[PDB]
Amino acid sequence: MEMDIRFRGDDLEAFEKALKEMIRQARKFAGTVTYTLDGNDLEIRITGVPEQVRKELAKEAERLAKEFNITVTYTIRLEHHHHHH
Numbered sequence: 866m867e868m869d870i871r872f873r874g875d876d877l878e879a880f881e882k883a884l885k886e887m888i889r890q891a892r893k894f895a896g897t898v899t900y901t902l903d904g905n906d907l908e909i910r911i912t913g914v915p916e917q918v919r920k921e922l923a924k925e926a927e928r929l930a931k932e933f934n935i936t937v938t939y940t941i942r943l944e945h946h947h948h949h950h
Contacts, residue, residue, distance in 0.1 A: 866914055866943065867910055867911065868910070868911045868919060868942060869910050870908075870922070870923075870926050870939040871908045871939065873905060873936035874905070874936065875935065879935045880902070880907050882929075883907075883926075883929040886925070886929060887922070890921075891911060894915075897911070897912040899912065923941075
């Protein structure tokens with residue numbers, strides 16, 4: 866299960882601190898943190914996260930967007946499979 870956390874803000878420091886806090890905790894988990902900064906939007910794709918930690922990371926993303934008053938949009942990449950029955 867992957868997670869795309871897109872931070873969108875006004876000043877660069879908002880991206881810097883928010884991203885660095887994500888990396889800060891993410892190092893404790895076996896998940897690869899990737900990100901792309903396109904114009905004014907930082908798309909952070911964390912590859913390999915468990916649903917229990919998904920809550921903690923997603924909620925701190927909210928927390929970051931609150932203290933920085935910036936925009937945050939996170940797409941949860943669900944593990945899927947075209948079932949038979």
